């Protein structure tokens, strides 16, 4: 794990060493070899894990989170490096020093075999995506969002930590694989149902679950692309993450400690599904997609069955990837009108084709085309809770058809219909924008075309 | 010259540049005296 | 360079993780009890000093 | 001042609490006591403003009857025990005053009301002095008798000077009385791992003493008294915006910083010790701390207030005054969290 | 809480006993940690100073490199003669209590009966 | 001239070099059980002298 | 800065390098009147500095290269926009009396300290006692405002107790139908659009508040324009003054210790003449103090500090 | 009101560099970042990384996994075994409780 973390820490004397004519080019060619450097984790022909250190490990869950993050930096830098032409020098590489140090921690938590440095590295993950938010954001209103984000994560995290030090106290080491092999089987009284609360509210909080997801939509609106790429792509994730490396030690209670989580999931999505098609702001739209496909993501790591956790895995890959794209092409419209209005731009069909090519697959690939890995983790996602109970299909299945329709209501109301000629400011393709929605949409073809590497833990 | 007032750093301070260079070579060799003392008085002790 | 390499450097992290574990809850345990009775070289609180007394024939002898 | 008394008052400042560390006589810690009260008011009254008189004398009624009540604890000890310091067997009474006294002293809540206005009106430097240098004798005094003194009380005092601290901190918009109030709840934690392990509480000492002074130190830069005074900061020196940033955060307790594994290893050492609730809610309140610490953060460096005309002219001048112990300062207070083990015993 | 053992120098950095101890590597990452703390302090402070970051004052950047090591190699050392006589007075204290300290026998997946939890 | 314009290209290079080296150290680290496990405990060839490096 | 605590101990006390011509003297008058020519002359023949009168340009001037800079560094006021649309909306009336207040700050500043390092007595031209004048002047005529005028006033509280006065202040009364005269033989086309409600205000406000003011504390030494042209006289007066009034004489070595260390100290000079105050007229916002502040830095000799700057032929750095 | 700077406007860029890739003001760097992202991007990591991807081989043990099923399948089948015993573990070897 040292071979991806040393050059992605030298990347940061890289950025500040390179030439201001100079930067941008060298970061971005060396953030994508260390993406390549990171595809060597794949080399799986063993049912062991690659442990390659005392205090880093490789997983089959791990692994898909830990490329995803190195190929969302350079295609972050990309995303980035337009609205910072008008930028101070040392500003822009501040900023790419951001996102470098961001990747860098995120591998690293990713990466954690100990849970006291995976809360550590969650918190030094927590500091600069707040600084990205409040330095780089556009409106007002970043100050409140990033107020929102981090005290939700902070809340969620103080009693993460106490139950943490607690279970290292009782056990004694915090490491996982120790954990996994002497698990103990709770006894079922009220302090466990606190210490499963503690534990599990952080990871719930930054999912997000719903009725505490009032922080995930003002920070995404607020955000700057790479901000929003990089909290919709990697930190829900995160979360997910968090939630099943820590439920392998808190049998058997989370059997009937489960049940409100899942209820709050389904109705949530089913809720924020119905905002989404009710929703005047595009990237507020996003972001609610992002709450229900993450619902779904917590429904099925409560319910704690082999096809809910892989569906989980593909589906936080394929979520990821997806929002990101999504979150780029509201970006670059953003660029070309300087407005965040649902129902503003509408003809951009006309005007710009092949972007609408990729908006009509970005949607497809959001309300779960066959035979994408969307569709994969929902589809298993869906199967694992009608095993868990039959009469959840009604809401998987309003979920599905609400889905669909803000998925269709976005493309029709953004490129379909008549073209606003007042619009006298549409440049007509960036290479750069373009080549940003090609590195998204084509690793989401080639996980269609394989679907093994992202199954995860269980198959 | 350039500057209307002569700064205060127009010329180096060479007795601080002599001092602060005398005194990290200093600290290094003594550094490596006592780590290579360190190392044979641990020989010593343990019998290696 | 195989599986092998992999399984024993497993082996080999899951011994010191479980042997850091067992000192620490050992380490637990000498503290509470060298803190609940001190007598190790732990908890040793302070005594007045001895060296600081007259043993001097003084003016009373009932001394 | 003349070199003859700022040397004379100078030394006497040293010399208190020196006096008051290497004395094993109860009455020669008091007299370092007097010895650190009485040179540090002139220093406190030296501007000579109405302001700096109220905050002396404040400080020196408040002071002084602390003082006699430790006077009071050390003679009744005297009393029982016919010897000068408390061993073992002296009174619970003796030692609940001791406590008592020696935390209005330091100036925890609820004995803290005059440490905001103290730290007011008094200089950025002798509010520094004031605020790390006049609490290491005090905390000698109460670390020498760990083992003697009441939990409950300690922890009751504890976990009021963390919630008042919070909540005086969230409200206040000068800066020396923000640094009194996160002294109050930096104070709190202290002595709220005192009874179980002094040890941390020396840790959470120094990390809080090489936080507080190079705040004080960017602080004393351009004599930044107020919110808006530091958020022109980057007008002014924008060098210094990163570092106000990262000591604020590490006075927050965030990781990675270093001011995480103060109270990182003082919940750790309560949850040995099986004091959950207590633990829990000194780190809600250190959230809240943090809280108040985020807000002047977004003031001075995330966000850029606008500047005045005359910044121009300011820009024009050039400054020597960030010294060499600065910087030092900053990057051991902000990045020596993998130095854990090192920095804990 | 290690103060009051016996044998306890006062005031001591480091006693005889820890020369029976390894010394530090030299070159180990905790101290080419602390001259990377070093040379970042030395850059910050040019920085700060409104000079060039990297080009100006090389002594003082040198100095600082070379006192920041200093130091933490002989804090260093001081910390694990810390640590190795803390291990040293627990292991002794364990080997003078063992009634207190009762080796436990761990029985095999055999004769336990561990109670199974189905997820249906 | 290129050697000093073009310096900055190294340092990346540089780092992935030197964790590989770091990892071979974690791995030369961690052998205590090297031709130990239960799984693969087999009798050394007579040409080599360990099983992995 | 190399003077210090240290410095005074090994001696540099003020008042052993003082002499009989180490006096403050300021020369202060209306607009047009025989201002620069006296002061050039008492300074001269005295063996004084002369300090002109600080104008927008005085700190370009006093720091750096020396040139006068761009306008947007220099206050962004103008003294000739003043004088064609005195009651513009933008607030250049303000602007230019708080600049040219922080300059005469600074000016001062620059004095005391030459006065109190080698203690060659300082002739300046019309010192931060007398542009007050000004102000009242702009806000008697409604150029300015209320809350300028109490911006102003406050800044000047913060700022003028912690110096010391001149031991003399000189002036010259020219009647304001005289300085309307010399403003039309000069010529200047913005200068001559002045009114005499203008001219009148100021010499009101020196009549009635700079002249007492200064006399409980120092020797005046008010000349008509005839006693003046003619700057001898003026000077006997000087040399047979009689200093027996003011803070100069309970000063000591300590007290001009702190003094010198304050006015060497530039930035402690003008901290507070950049008080947060957020009166329209002065405050500025980000981007425009963004887009300004990167410019100075980017212009020559800017970017570091003085000496660290190896585009204008500085060496040694790597040594320092 | 306050000496604040007007809003900028947002030029044509493609006026002044008609072949503008989106990546920088000046016509060299811009191409140059082009061609860094699309070869480093695309040439070296979408094909490479792909490749190496096809061609890790037995990836988690599958077609190990389904060769040692074929196997026992055989064995199991010429020996008249049980494909599948019931119980993975053998009864002999686990004791149960008396009550
Ligand atoms: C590299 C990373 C570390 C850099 C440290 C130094 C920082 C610095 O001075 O940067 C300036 C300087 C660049 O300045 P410049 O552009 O040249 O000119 C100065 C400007 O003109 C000055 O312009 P100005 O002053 O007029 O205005 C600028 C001002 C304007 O102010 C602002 O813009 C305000 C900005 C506010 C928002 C930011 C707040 C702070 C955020 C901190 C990070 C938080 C998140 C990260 C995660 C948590 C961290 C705790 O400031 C800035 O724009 C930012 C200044 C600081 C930038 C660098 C910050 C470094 C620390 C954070 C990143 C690294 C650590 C975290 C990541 C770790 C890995 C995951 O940086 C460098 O030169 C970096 C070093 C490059 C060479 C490295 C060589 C290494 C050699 C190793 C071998 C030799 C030693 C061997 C030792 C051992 C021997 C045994
Ligand atoms: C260019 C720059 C580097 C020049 C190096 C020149 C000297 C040289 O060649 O040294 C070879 C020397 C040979 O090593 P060795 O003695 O053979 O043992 C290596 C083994 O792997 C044994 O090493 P180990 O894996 O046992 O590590 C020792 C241990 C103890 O070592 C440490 O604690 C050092 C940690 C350095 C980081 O490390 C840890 O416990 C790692 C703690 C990780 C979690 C820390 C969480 C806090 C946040 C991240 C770190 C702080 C960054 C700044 C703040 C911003 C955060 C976002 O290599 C090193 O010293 C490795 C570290 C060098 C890079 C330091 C970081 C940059
Ligand atoms: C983001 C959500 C935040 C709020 C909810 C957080 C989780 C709620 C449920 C857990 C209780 C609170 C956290 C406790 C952390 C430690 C848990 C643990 O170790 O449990 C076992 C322990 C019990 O210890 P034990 O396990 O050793 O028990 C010993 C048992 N015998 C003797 C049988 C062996 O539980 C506790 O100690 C819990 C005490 C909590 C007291 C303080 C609560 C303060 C308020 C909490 C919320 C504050 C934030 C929100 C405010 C409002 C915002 C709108
Ligand atoms: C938001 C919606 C909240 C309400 C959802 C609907 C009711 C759910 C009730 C529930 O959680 O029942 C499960 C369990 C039943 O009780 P039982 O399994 O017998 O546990 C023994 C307890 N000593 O109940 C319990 O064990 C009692 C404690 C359950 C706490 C669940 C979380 C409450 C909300 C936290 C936020
Ligand atoms: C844990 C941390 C432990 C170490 C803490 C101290 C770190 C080093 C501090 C000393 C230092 O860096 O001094 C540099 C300074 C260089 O002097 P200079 O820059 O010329 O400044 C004089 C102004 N004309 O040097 C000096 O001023 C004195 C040089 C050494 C004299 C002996
Ligand atoms: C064991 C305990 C060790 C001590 C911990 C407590 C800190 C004690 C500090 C004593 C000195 C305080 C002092 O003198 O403060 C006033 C001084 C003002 O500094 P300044 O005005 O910039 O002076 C420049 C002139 N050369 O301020 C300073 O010079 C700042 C001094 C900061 C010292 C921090 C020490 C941290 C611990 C090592
Ligand atoms: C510049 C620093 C130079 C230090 C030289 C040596 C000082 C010394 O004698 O240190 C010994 C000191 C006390 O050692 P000890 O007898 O254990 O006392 C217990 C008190 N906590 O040991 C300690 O106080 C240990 C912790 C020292 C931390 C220093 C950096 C902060
Ligand atoms: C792992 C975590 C990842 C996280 C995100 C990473 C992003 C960065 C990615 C960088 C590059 C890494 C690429 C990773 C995927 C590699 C795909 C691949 O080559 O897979 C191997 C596969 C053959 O493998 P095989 O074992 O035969 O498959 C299982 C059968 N037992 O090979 C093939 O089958 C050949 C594939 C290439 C040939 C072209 C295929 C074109 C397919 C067109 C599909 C059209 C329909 C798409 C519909 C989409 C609807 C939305
Ligand atoms: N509004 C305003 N104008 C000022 C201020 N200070 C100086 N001026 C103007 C008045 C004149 O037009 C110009 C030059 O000032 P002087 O009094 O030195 O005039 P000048 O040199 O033309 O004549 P003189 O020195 O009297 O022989 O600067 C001030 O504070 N406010
Ligand atoms: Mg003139």
């Given at each position: 794990m040292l071979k991806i973390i040393l050059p992605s820490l030298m990347l940061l004397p890289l950025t500040w060493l390179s030439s201001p004519k100079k930067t941008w080019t060298n970061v971005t060619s060396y953030s994508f070899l260390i993406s390549l450097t990171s595809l060597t984790l794949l080399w799986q022909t063993d049912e062991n894990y690659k442990n390659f250190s005392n205090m880093f490990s490789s997983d089959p869950l791990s692994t898909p989170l830990i490329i995803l993050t190195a190929w969302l930096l350079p295609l972050m830098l990309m995303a980035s490096q337009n609205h910072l032409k008008k930028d101070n020098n040392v500003l822009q590489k501040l900023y790419i020093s951001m996102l470098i140090s961001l990747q860098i921690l995120l591998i690293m938590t990713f990466s954690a075999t100990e849970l006291i440095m995976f809360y550590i590295l969650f918190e030094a993950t927590l500091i600069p995506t707040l600084i990205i938010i409040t330095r780089w954001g556009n409106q007002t209103e970043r100050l409140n969002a990033g107020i929102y984000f981090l005290f939700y994560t902070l809340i969620g995290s103080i009693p993460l930590l106490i139950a943490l030090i607690l279970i290292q106290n009782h056990v004694?080491?915090?490491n996982l694989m120790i954990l996994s092999f002497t698990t103990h089987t709770l006894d079922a009284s009220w302090s466990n149902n606190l210490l499963w609360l503690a534990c599990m509210m952080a990871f719930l909080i930054k999912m997000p679950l719903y009725g505490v997801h009032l922080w995930l939509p003002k920070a995404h609106v607020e955000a700057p692309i790479a901000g929003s790429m990089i909290l919709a792509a990697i930190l829900l994730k995160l979360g997910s993450y968090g939630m099943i490396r820590i439920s392998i030690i808190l049998d058997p209670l989370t059997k009937y400690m489960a049940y409100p989580f899942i209820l709050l999931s389904l109705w949530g999505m089913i809720m924020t599904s119905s905002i989404c098609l009710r929703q005047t702001d595009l990237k507020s739209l996003i972001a609610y997609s992002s709450v229900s496909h993450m619902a779904l993501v917590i429904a099925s790591i409560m319910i704690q069955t082999p096809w809910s956790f892989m569906g989980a895995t593909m589906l936080m890959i394929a979520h990821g990837l997806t929002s990101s794209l999504l979150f780029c092409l509201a970006n670059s419209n953003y660029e070309r009108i300087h407005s965040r209005t649902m129902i503003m731009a509408r003809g951009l069909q006309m005007v710009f084709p092949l972007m609408a090519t990729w908006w009509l697959m970005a949607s497809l690939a959001n309300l779960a085309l066959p035979p994408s890995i969307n569709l994969m983790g929902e589809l298993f996602i869906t199967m694992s809770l009608f095993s868990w109970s039959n009469f959840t299909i009604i809401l998987m299945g309003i979920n599905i058809i609400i889905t669909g329709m803000y998925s269709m209501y976005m493309i029709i109301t953004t490129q379909r219909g008549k073209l606003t000629n007042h619009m006298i400011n549409l440049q007509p393709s960036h290479t750069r924008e373009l080549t940003l929605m090609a590195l998204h949409m084509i690793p989401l073809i080639l996980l269609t075309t394989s679907p093994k590497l992202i199954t995860g833990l269980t198959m | 010259k350039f500057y209307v007032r002569e700064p205060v750093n127009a010329k180096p301070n060479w007795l601080a540049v002599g001092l602060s260079v005398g005194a990290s070579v200093f600290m290094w060799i003594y550094l490596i005296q006592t780590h290579n003392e360190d190392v044979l008085e641990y020989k010593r002790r343990n019998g290696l | 360079d195989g599986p092998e390499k992999n399984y024993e450097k497993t082996l080999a992290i899951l011994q010191i993780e479980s042997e850091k574990a067992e000192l620490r809850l050992k380490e637990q345990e000498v503290r509470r009890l060298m803190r609940a009775?001190?007598?190790?070289?732990?908890?040793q609180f302070p005594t007045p000093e001895?060296?600081?007394?007259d043993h001097s024939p003084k003016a009373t002898p009932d001394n | 001042m003349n070199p003859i008394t700022l040397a004379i008052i100078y030394f006497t400042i040293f010399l208190g609490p020196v006096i008051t560390m290497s004395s094993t006589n109860l009455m020669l810690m008091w007299v370092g006591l007097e010895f650190s009260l009485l040179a540090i008011i002139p220093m406190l009254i030296n501007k000579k403003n109405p302001r700096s008189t109220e905050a002396a004398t404040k400080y020196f009624v408040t002071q002084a009857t602390a003082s006699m009540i430790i006077l009071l604890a050390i003679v009744l000890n005297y009393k029982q025990l016919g010897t000068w310091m408390f061993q073992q067997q002296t009174n619970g009474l003796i030692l609940n005053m001791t406590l008592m006294a020696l935390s209005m002293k330091l100036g925890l809540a609820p004995f803290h009301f005059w440490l905001p206005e103290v730290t007011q009106g008094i200089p950025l430097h002798m509010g520094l002095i004031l605020l790390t240098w006049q609490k290491i004798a005090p905390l000698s005094i109460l670390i020498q008798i760990y083992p003697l003194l009441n939990s409950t009380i300690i922890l009751m005092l504890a976990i009021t000077s963390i919630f008042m601290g919070a909540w005086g901190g969230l409200n206040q918009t000068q800066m020396r009385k923000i640094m009194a109030y996160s002294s109050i709840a930096h104070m709190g934690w202290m002595l709220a791992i005192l009874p179980y392990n002094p040890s941390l509480t020396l840790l959470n000492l120094m990390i809080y003493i090489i936080l507080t002074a190079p705040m004080f130190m960017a602080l004393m830069l351009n004599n930044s008294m107020t919110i808006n005074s530091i958020s022109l900061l980057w007008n002014k020196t924008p060098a210094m915006l990163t570092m106000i940033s990262l000591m604020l955060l590490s006075l927050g307790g965030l990781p990675p910083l270093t001011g995480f594994l103060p109270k990182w290893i003082i919940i750790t050492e309560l949850m040995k010790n099986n004091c959950l609730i207590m633990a829990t809610l000194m780190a809600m309140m250190a959230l809240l701390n943090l809280f108040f610490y985020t807000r002047l953060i977004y003031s001075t460096s995330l966000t850029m207030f606008p500047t005045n005309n005359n910044s121009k002219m300011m820009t024009h001048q050039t400054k020597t005054k960030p010294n060499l112990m600065f910087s030092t300062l900053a990057i051991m207070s902000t990045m020596t969290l993998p130095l854990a083990p090192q920095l804990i015993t | 809480m290690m103060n009051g053992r016996p044998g306890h120098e006062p005031l001591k950095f480091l006693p005889d006993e820890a020369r029976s101890l390894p010394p530090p590597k030299l070159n180990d990452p905790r101290l080419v940690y602390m001259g990377l703390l070093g040379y970042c302090t030395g850059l910050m402070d040019n920085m700060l100073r409104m000079r060039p970051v990297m080009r100006a004052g090389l002594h003082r950047q040198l100095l600082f490199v070379t006192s920041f090591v200093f130091a933490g190699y002989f804090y260093l050392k001081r910390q694990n003669y810390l640590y190795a006589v803390k291990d040293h007075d627990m292991f002794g204290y364990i080997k003078l209590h063992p009634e207190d300290f009762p080796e436990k026998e761990k029985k095999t997946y055999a004769e336990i009966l561990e109670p199974f939890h189905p997820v249906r | 001239q290129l050697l000093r314009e073009h310096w900055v290209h190294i340092l990346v290079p540089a780092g992935f070099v030197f964790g590989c080296y770091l990892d071979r150290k974690d791995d030369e680290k961690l052998t205590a059980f090297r031709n130990k496990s239960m799984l693969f405990q087999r009798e050394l060839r007579p040409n080599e002298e360990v099983t992995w490096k | 800065l190399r003077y210090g605590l240290l410095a005074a101990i090994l001696g540099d006390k003020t008042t052993k390098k003082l002499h009989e011509y180490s006096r403050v003297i300021t020369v202060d008058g209306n607009i047009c009147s025989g201002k620069n020519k006296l002061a050039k002359e008492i300074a001269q023949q005295l063996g004084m500095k002369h300090y002109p009168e600080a104008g927008i340009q005085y700190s370009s001037t006093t720091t750096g290269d020396g040139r006068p800079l761009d306008i947007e560094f220099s206050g962004s006021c103008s003294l000739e926009k003043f004088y064609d649309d005195?009651?513009?909306?933008?607030?250049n009336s303000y602007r230019l009396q708080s600049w040219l207040y922080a300059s005469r700050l600074l000016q001062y500043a620059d004095a005391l300290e030459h006065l109190l390092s080698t203690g060659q007595g300082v002739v300046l031209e019309r010192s931060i006692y007398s542009d007050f004048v000004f102000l009242e002047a702009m806000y008697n005529q409604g150029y300015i405002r209320k809350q300028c005028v109490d911006h102003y006033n406050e800044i000047k509280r913060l700022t003028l107790p912690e110096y010391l006065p001149p031991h003399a202040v000189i002036y010259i009364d020219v009647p304001v139908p005289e300085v309307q005269s010399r403003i039309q033989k000069k010529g200047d086309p913005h200068e001559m659009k002045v009114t005499s409600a203008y001219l009148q205000d100021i010499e009101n406000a020196y009549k009635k508040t700079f002249l007492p003011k200064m006399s409980e504390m120092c020797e005046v030494l008010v000349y008509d324009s005839w006693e003046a042209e003619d700057p001898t006289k003026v000077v006997e007066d000087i040399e047979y003054l009689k200093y027996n009034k003011g803070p100069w004489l309970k000063q000591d070595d300590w007290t001009f210790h702190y003094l010198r260390m304050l006015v060497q100290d530039k930035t402690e000079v003008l901290n507070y003449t950049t008080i947060p105050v957020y009166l329209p007229e002065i405050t500025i916002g980000a981007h425009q103090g963004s887009r300004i502040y990167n410019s100075f830095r980017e212009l020559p000799g800017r970017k570091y500090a003085p000496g660290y700057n190896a585009e204008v032929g500085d060496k040694w750095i790597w040594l320092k | 009101q306050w000496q604040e700077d007007p809003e900028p406007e947002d030029e044509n860029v493609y006026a002044k560099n008609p072949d503008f890739h989106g990546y920088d003001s000046d016509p060299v760097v811009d191409v140059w970042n082009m061609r860094a992202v699309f070869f480093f991007g695309?040439?070296?990591?979408l094909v490479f990384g792909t490749t190496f991807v096809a061609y890790v081989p037995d990836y988690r043990m599958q077609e190990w996994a389904r060769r040692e099923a074929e196997r026992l399948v055989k064995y199991r089948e010429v020996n008249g075994l049980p494909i599948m015993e019931s119980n993975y573990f053998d009864p002999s070897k686990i004791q149960l409780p008396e009550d």
């Open positions: 004694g080491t915090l | - | 009775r001190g007598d190790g070289p732990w908890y001895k060296e600081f007394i | - | - | - | 005195p009651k513009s909306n933008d607030g | 695309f040439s070296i990591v």
